[PDB]
């Protein structure tokens, strides 16, 4: 079905994969002025998939994508019904459903004043400042940047790992419609699961929404010291392979909670010990489907993060409907001595989470509500799965199966991932930005 890679905002389909990234949130002050600026800004800065997959030699110093909130489209006079059920009322209005603690959200997210967001991906912060200025210059006061969240890859060997220390970005759906390599174990879905209007999208979209996509953005603050402290105070005693020490048991616990070792080695393949080499191998680190641990939790818990967000075999076989693309990035400094040596967070660090799907309710929202937060999911298992330890928000946050030996044992885990704000955005096709929004 050959997708128009030159017209699709790159981050939706390929992911910026740049070291630094900045999210510039803004509200529209003067619509007319804004659309006019848009007409000159897009062709000059909005980077497409085609540009991201082309050789470095011709890529910008920084990538820029742009998304709008419902109130943003409203402010710009674009009143078409995009067809998604959550997008219209905003995420904060949906936060309770996600199981969020509203007291934790902070402005300017605690409402719908945010009209859209500019995603700037570059390798150096100074380039980030350069393009940031270019934005508030091309647009001047026709808009007002209300907040900017910036993130960067963690140092050295940690690059690519989120702040709890786990390698992130391993498993991603592969969509048909473009020449691309498929890793063994990688889901292959119709372009409609991610791009609105395309094949597989069950929603009813206006024609201009073609090749667009909804972004679920979550500003997460992570309590790292607390996380470690907790795994030590709960280190798993042993497993098939033998008795585990303190560290060993703690490391094993963390891995049991995620479904992967901090190295990326999926526990359904390295069930009793880490396999660094396997983790670093994209041709092997994702070739599993729990088909060998369906009715028992020896190889992998029923409620491990990755298994809850992508149950794979736990639901019969392949299913397109619930896959989504992720393009998140860590933020904040590393954990100090005074921090870990106290088990109490003393600095702001976390994840700037970005998830793309044609239907919010079938991706992020589904993974969150229907799976992660559902104690009875995966369905019909010998032992109750429980609440996903990492992002599940149903209380009591009780998850079972962590200890492979005495599986029935349950653990009520403290929430280490804290929602500070979020929003639902729509990223139109590059052409739509000018033919419809700026029109």
Catalytic residues: 168
CB of 249 or CB of 330, closer to ligand HEM = 330
Nearest to ligand HEM of 127, 164 (CB atom) = 164
CB neighbours of residue 344 within 10 Å: 12
Q: Which of residues 144-163 bind ligand HEM (CB under 6 A)?
A: 162
* Terminal Cα distance for the chain, rounded: 28
Give the shortest CB-365-to-ligand HEM separation in angstroms.
7
Residues 332-391 that bind ligand HEM (CB under 6 A): 351, 353, 364, 367-368, 372, 390-391
CB closer to ligand HEM, 45 vs 312: 312
Size of the site for ligand HEM (CB under 6 A): 26
Site string for ligand HEM, 409-428 (x = CB under 6 A): --------x-----------
Q: State the nearest-atom distance from the C-beta of 153 to ligand HEM, in Å.
A: 14
Handedness of CA 68, 74, 79, 81 (dihedral sign): positive
Residue whose CB is less far from ligand HEM, 41 or 261: 261
* Rounded least distance, CB 88 to ligand HEM, Å: 20
Q: How far is the CB of 37 from ligand HEM (least distance, A)?
A: 34
Nearest to 371 by CA among 299, 323, 425: 323
- How far, in Å, CA of 23 to CA of 121, rounded? 9
- Residue 171 touching ligand HEM (CB under 6 A): yes
Q: How far is the CB of 56 from ligand HEM (least distance, A)?
A: 24
**Which residue, among 276, 278, 229, 231, has the nearest Cα to 258 in the 3D structure?**
231
Minimum distance of ligand HEM from residue 391's CB (angstroms): 4
Among 4, 60, 160, 169, the residue binding ligand HEM under the rule CB under 6 A is: 169
Q: Does 239 bind ligand HEM (CB under 6 A)?
A: no
Outline where DSSP puts E strands in 15-59.
20-28
Helix (H, G, I), strand (E, B) or coil at 127: helix
Cα 282 from Cα 163, distance rounded (Å) = 21
| CA–CA dist 163, 418 (Å, integer) | 13
Which positions from 284 to 323 touch ligand HEM by CB under 6 A, shown as an x/- string?
---------------------xx--xx-------------
Nearer to ligand HEM, 176 or 310 (CB): 310
In sequence order, what are the residues at sequence separation of 6 or more whose Cβ sits closer than 8 angstroms to the Cβ of residue 406? none
218 lies in the binding site for ligand HEM (CB under 6 A): yes
Q: At closest approach, how far in Å is the CB of 247 from ligand HEM? A: 20
Dump the DSSP string for 99-139: T--GGG--TTSSSS---EEEEEEESSHHHHHHHHHHHHHHS
In angstroms, the CA 422 to CA 413 distance is: 23
Q: Which is nearer to ligand HEM, 223 or 381 (CB)?
A: 223
Task: In whole angstroms, give the CA distance from residue 271 to residue 266.
Answer: 8
d(CA 320, CA 317): 10
Which listed residue (21, 84, 168, 248) binds ligand HEM by CB under 6 A? 168
DSSP labels for 180-233? ----TT--EE-GGGTSBTSTT--S---GGGTTBEEEEEEEEEE-HHHHHHHHHT
Rounded CA-CA distance 323/326 in Å is 10
For position 220 contacting ligand HEM by CB under 6 A, the verdict is yes
User: What's the half-sphere exposure (Cβ side, CA atoms, 13 Å) at 421?
Assistant: 14
Q: Which is nearer to ligand HEM, 310 or 374 (CB)?
A: 310
- Is 264 within 8 Å of 167 (Cβ atoms)? yes
Among 149, 170, 265, 415, binds ligand HEM (CB under 6 A): 170
Nearest distance from C-beta of residue 128 to ligand HEM, angstroms: 22
Residue numbers 390-409 binding ligand HEM by CB under 6 A = 390-391
Query: Rounded to the nearest 10 degrees, what angle do helices 125-138 and 31-45 cross at?
Result: 140
> Is 208 or 220 the residue whose CB approaches ligand HEM more closely?
220
The residues of the shown chain that bind ligand HEM, judged by CB under 6 A, are: 162, 164, 166, 168-171, 218, 220, 222, 258, 260, 305-306, 309-310, 326, 351, 353, 364, 367-368, 372, 390-391, 417
């Amino acid at each position: 079905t050959i997708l128009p890679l030159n017209n699709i905002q790159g981050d939706i389909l390929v992911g910026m994969k740049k070291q630094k990234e900045r999210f510039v949130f803004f509200q529209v002050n003067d619509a007319t002025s804004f659309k006019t600026a848009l007409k000159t800004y897009v062709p000059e800065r909005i980077t497409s998939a085609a540009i991201l997959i082309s050789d470095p030699s011709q890529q910008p110093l920084a990538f820029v994508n742009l998304g709008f909130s419902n109130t943003g489209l409203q402010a710009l006079g674009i009143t078409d019904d995009l067809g998604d059920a959550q997008f219209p009322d905003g995420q904060f209005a949906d936060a309770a459903n996600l199981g969020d603690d509203l007291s934790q959200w902070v402005a300017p997210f605690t409402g719908t004043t945010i009209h859209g967001v500019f995603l700037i991906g570059s390798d150096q912060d100074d380039f980030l400042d350069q393009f940031t200025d270019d934005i508030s210059s091309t647009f001047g006061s026709s808009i007002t940047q209300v907040q900017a969240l910036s993130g960067s890859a963690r140092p050295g060997d940690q690059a690519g790992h989120e702040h709890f220390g786990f390698l992130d970005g391993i498993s991603q759906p592969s969509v048909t419609g473009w020449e691309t390599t498929v890793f063994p174990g990688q889901a292959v879905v119709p372009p409609g699961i991610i791009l609105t209007g395309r094949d597989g999208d069950t929603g009813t979209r206006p024609s201009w929404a073609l090749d667009g996509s909804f972004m679920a953005f979550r500003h997460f603050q992570q309590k790292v010291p607390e996380f470690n402290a907790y795994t030590l105070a709960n280190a798993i005693p042993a497993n098939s392979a033998g008795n585990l020490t303190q560290q060993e048991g703690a490391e094993f616990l963390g891995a049991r909670m995620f479904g992967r070792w901090k190295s990326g080695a999926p526990i359904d393949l390295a069930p009793t010990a880490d396999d660094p080499a396997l983790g670093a191998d994209p041709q092997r680190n994702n070739n599993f489907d729990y088909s060998d641990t369906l009715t028992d939790e020896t190889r992998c818990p029923f409620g491990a993060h990755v298994r809850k967000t992508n149950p794979r075999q736990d639901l019969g076989g392949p299913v397109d409907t619930f896959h989504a693309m992720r393009s998140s990035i860590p933020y904040g400094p590393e954990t100090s001595d005074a921090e870990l040596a106290s088990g109490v967070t003393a600095q702001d660090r976390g994840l700037l989470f970005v998830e793309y799907q044609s239907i919010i309710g079938n991706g992020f929202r589904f993974q969150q509500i229907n799976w992660a937060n559902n104690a009875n999911f995966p369905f019909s298992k010998p032992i109750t799965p429980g609440i996903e330890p990492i992002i599940g928000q149903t209380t009591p946050r009780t998850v079972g199966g962590l200890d492979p030996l005495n599986q029935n044992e349950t653990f009520t885990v403290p929430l280490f991932v804290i929602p500070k704000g979020g929003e639902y955005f729509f990223l139109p096709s590059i052409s739509a930005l000018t033919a419809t929004i700026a029109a």
